From a paper:
Intimin is a 94 kDa outer membrane protein, essential for the intimate attachment of bacterial cells to the host cell surface, followed by actin pedestal formation. Intimin is classified as an inverse autotransporter, a subclass of the type 5 secretion system that transports the C-terminal extracellular region or passenger through the lumen of the N-terminal β-barrel located in the outer membrane. The intimin passenger forms a rod-like extension consisting of four tandem bacterial immunoglobulin-like (Big) domains (subdomains D00–D0–D1–D2) capped by a C-terminal C-type lectin-like domain (D3). Here, we describe the crystal structures of the combined intimin domains D00–D0 and D0–D1 from the EPEC strain E2348/69 determined at 1.5 Å and 1.8 Å resolution, respectively.
The structure of D00–D0 has an elongated conformation, spanning 78 Å between the N- and C-termini. The subdomain D00 also exhibits an IgSF fold with a β-sandwich, yet it shows distinct structural differences when compared to the s-type fold seen in subdomains D0 and D1. In addition to the two common β-sheets, β-strands A1 and B2 form a separate small β-sheet due to shortened β-strands D and E. The presence of a third β-sheet in an Ig-fold is not novel as it has been previously described in Ig-domain subtype C425. The β-sandwich of D00 is additionally disrupted in strand C by a short α-helix induced by residue Pro515. A structural similarity search with the D00 structure on PDBeFold revealed similarity to the outermost extracellular domains of several Cadherin types (EC). The D00–D0 connector adopts an S-shaped conformation connecting the D0 and the D00 domains through a hydrogen bond network and solvent-free dry interface. The tight interaction between these two key residues leads to the formation of a classical type I turn in the connector. The asymmetric unit of D00–D0 crystals contained six molecules. The sidechain rotamer of all the implicated residues and thus the hydrogen bond network of the D00–D0 connector region is conserved in all six molecules. OLIGOMER results had a better fit to experimental data (χ2 = 2.45 for merged file) and revealed that the majority of D00–D0 is present in the elongated conformation as shown in the crystal structure.
Numbering used by the authors: 452 to 655
Amino acid sequence: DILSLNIPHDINGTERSTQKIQLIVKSKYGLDRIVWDDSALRSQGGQIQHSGSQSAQDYQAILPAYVQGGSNVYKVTARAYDRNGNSSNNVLLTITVLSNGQVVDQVGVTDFTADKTSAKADGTEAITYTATVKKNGVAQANVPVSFNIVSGTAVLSANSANTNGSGKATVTLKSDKPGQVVVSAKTAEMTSALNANAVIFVDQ
Ligand SMILES: [Br-]
Ligand SMILES: [Br-]
Ligand SMILES: [Cl-]
Ligand SMILES: [Cl-]
Ligand SMILES: [Cl-]
Ligand code: NA
């Protein structure tokens, strides 16, 4: 009744982008300032800063670079103060960082990796690929993933599989010919498939 702060929306954005923060303040005596703990962002070189306008509630987040294999989720807090020195609750804002190649709010393949970098070219040894599907960093269950050989000569065990409860779908690759092979994974919302790193089948 005297002073409240609400943050209606968390932030999901591309690494190194600037993201405006929406604050909703109600203050009987008048807002004086917002005070932030952004130490989680600063651990990776991001920050929360005033947008430079004349408004005491106009802030933005500078997102850090994406950390491969990292959390990429940053929890920061804001507290409003009024002109009498009262404060609001210390309110949580969650900032999730996506890599340059990913799309905010999309159900998309974020990772597509193989268990081996090489295999024998005997048409028998299998390289197993795992695709992870997330939306804003959260794994998505039961999503169909389409698999395709982009280049090279090989055979996929299947052309589509649905993700499990951990957001993962798998397929195997075999080849009778030596050479490099690139396999890709895609979900329906993506604009193009995500290529895995090349693997090589070797004669021996
Ligand atoms: Br809220
Ligand atoms: Br697809
Ligand atoms: Cl509050
Ligand atoms: Cl090998
Ligand atoms: Cl999708
Ligand atoms: Na919120």
